[PDB]
Write a protein that binds this ligand. Structure first.
Ligand SMILES: Fc1ccccc1CNc1cn[nH]c1
Length: 435
């Protein structure tokens, strides 16, 4: 695996021991060969599990998710996918890693896709080696891969709203269920219906994942209601998955706005990862996977792959050269390499809008490419009437930094800034000049 110009896809089935068995063996061999190595975890939760699995090896944990004193001598760095891409974008020195290991390498967040593009380009140039660890590599067509124990697969109508009758199988279960929903708002409604029926429900999504995931360990629960974030190495002691087989797809319409299309079918890779939360214990056969629709390759035209090009266009590789997307996922976007390359000052603005601003890549790009400075929030108020953001069916309102009450009406409308109450609260604070 460790020879220059090699990219290895470590595609053992879910729970085959890629993280707990194979990764420490790879790391021991890398230190032996004096290979400067990076290990990319999808989430802080996974970074912490890796620290436990690599305990006793010289690894620098570039995450506050791990409280450990470093020797100062480590040639192996461990950080989140997003942290890798973030450091490449910033005027911060990132070493030339000889070996690039990405765990949960199916992750379709823009920063993960960009990290794969950068790494796979370095390998294709003959500059480095890489290992992508995932049961479900890009373009996989198998929603039903092997497992540690036999799984009971059942195609069944799954509720996507509160229900009063007709789904007794859902609540009649006495074990623990992980239930994949397409959105936070859809999970809230299902969670409330289960709570009313006497169930203990934990809800997970991207913004709450680190905090809430700990509850699955510290308290008893009947259901976990989760978005697609639990596809990225989240482990549960569960015996059933309920899978809507539905997701939302961000779509850029007419180059001018982002909508959240769907819900629509998940990819085969997503379905396999959702299913792969169970069947993990060889001593407990007959875990259940109930699934409520088909799969389709909905990553085609999905805004994350265009956002990944925006990130890679703004990352230095070699003189004018720009990293390509990893070949198997490179057709998911119709884009010109370099089309999103910003001049130094607009790139700095782009970075700050993502990092401090917490804006979606697409929206950060529109603002930075328009020549707007990070603190200039006039654009949050001067859009067309149909860009009005609504809150409880009235136009949303904030007090500007000038102390004026104004309707939130952004010049560029990205549905992700108001997809739930927490998102819209964050965007209101942004529009108000509070960060
Ligand atoms: F009530 C005010 C007086 C002066 C400036 C602003 C406000 C409103 N609150 C706010 C919005 N952004 N930052 C602060």
């Amino acid at each position: 695996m460790l020879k220059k110009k090699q990219l290895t896809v470590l595609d053992l089935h879910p729970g085959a021991g890629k993280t707990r068995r194979v990764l420490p063996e790879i790391v021991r061999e890398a230190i032996k060969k004096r290979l400067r190595t990076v290990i990319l975890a999808p989430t802080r939760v996974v970074a912490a599990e890796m620290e436990e699995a690599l305990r006793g090896l010289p690894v620098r944990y570039m995450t506050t998710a791990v409280n450990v004193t470093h020797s100062g001598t480590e040639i192996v760095d461990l950080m989140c996918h997003a942290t890798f891409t973030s450091r490449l974008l910033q005027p911060i020195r990132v070493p030339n890693y000889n070996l690039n290991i990405m765990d949960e390498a199916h992750f379709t967040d823009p920063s993960s896709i960009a990290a794969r593009g950068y790494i796979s380009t370095r390998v294709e140039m003959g500059e480095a080696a890489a290992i992508f660890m995932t049961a479900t590599p890009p373009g996989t067509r198998d929603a039903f891969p092997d497992s540690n124990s036999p799984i009971m697969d059942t195609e069944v109508e799954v509720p996507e709203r509160a229900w009063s009758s007709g789904f007794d199988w859902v609540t009649d279960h006495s074990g623990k269920t992980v239930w994949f929903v397409p959105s936070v708002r859809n999970g809230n409604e299902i969670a409330a219906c289960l709570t009313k029926a006497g169930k203990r429900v934990i809800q997970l999504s991207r913004k709450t994942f680190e905090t809430e995931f700990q509850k699955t360990k510290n308290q008893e629960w009947d259901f976990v209601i989760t978005t697609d974030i639990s596809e990225m190495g989240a482990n549960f002691k569960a015996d059933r998955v309920i899978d809507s087989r539905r997701c939302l797809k961000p779509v850029i319409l007419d180059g001018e706005r982002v909508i959240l299309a769907g819900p629509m079918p998940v990819t085969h890779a997503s379905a396999a990862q959702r299913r792969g939360r169970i069947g993990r214990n060889p001593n407990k056969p007959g875990d259940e996977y109930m699934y409520g629709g088909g799969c389709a390759e909905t990553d085609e035209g999905h805004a994350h792959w265009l956002e990944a090009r925006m990130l890679l266009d703004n990352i230095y590789l070699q003189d004018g050269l720009i990293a390509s997307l990893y070949r198997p996922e490179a057709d998911k976007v119709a884009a010109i390499e370099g089309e999103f390359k910003l001049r130094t000052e607009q790139r700095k603005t782009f970075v700050e809008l993502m990092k401090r601003g917490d804006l979606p890549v697409w929206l950060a790009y529109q603002v930075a490419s328009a020549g707007i400075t990070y603190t200039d929030r006039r654009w949050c108020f001067d859009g067309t009437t149909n860009n009005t953001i609504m809150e409880d069916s009235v136009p949303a309102e904030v007090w500007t930094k000038y102390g004026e009450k104004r309707v939130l009406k952004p010049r560029w409308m990205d549905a992700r800034v108001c997809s739930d109450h927490a998102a819209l609260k964050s965007f209101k604070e942004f529009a108000a000049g509070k960060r």
